[PDB]
């Protein structure tokens, strides 16, 4: 509360750490449909469906253009992003298998690096 404060963690290496997160998502082998924003011209309703679209290239570009306030808005969007997946895609599907696998992936990432 006011003049009230827990002790101060050190963030000023989050940023960091998030661009390290992210550059190991987008390298990771079933990236591949999620480093770029669906189309949706293209993609039969997506676009009404889905109502917040979200994508790695756009997680970097945010990240970059400091659009984070902190690293719990950072790992809202990425985990929309398999949020999204989950909703158009059925689990057996290519897809589907790609976001399961990848947000398992930054689960651990994630814990490792910050719990």
């Known amino acids: 509360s006011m003049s009230v404060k827990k002790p101060k963690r050190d963030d000023s290496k989050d940023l ?11 390298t ?4 591949w449909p999620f ?11 997506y676009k009404k469906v ?10 970097r570009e945010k990240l970059s253009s400091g659009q984070y306030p902190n690293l719990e ?5 990425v985990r929309l992003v ?5 909703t158009f895609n059925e689990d057996d599907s290519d ?3 790609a976001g399961h696998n990848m947000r398992k992936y930054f689960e651990k990432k994630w814990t ?3 719990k």
């Not at 990771?28 to 990236?31: L, S, T």
């Not at 480093?35 to 309703?45: D, F, I, M, R, S």
């Not at 889905?50 to 290239?57: E, G, L, N, R, T």
């Open 35 to 45: 480093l770029l924003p669906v189309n949706l011209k293209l993609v039969p309703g």
């Open 73 to 77: 808005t950072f790992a809202l969007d």
């Open 95 to 97: 897809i589907g298998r």
């Open 16 to 26: 960091a750490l998030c661009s390290m997160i992210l550059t190991e998502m987008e």
């Open 50 to 59: 889905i109502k917040k679209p979200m994508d790695f290239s756009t997680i």
């Open 28 to 31: 990771h082998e079933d990236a």
């Open 82 to 86: 398999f949020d999204n997946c989950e």
């Open 112 to 114: 490792d690096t910050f």
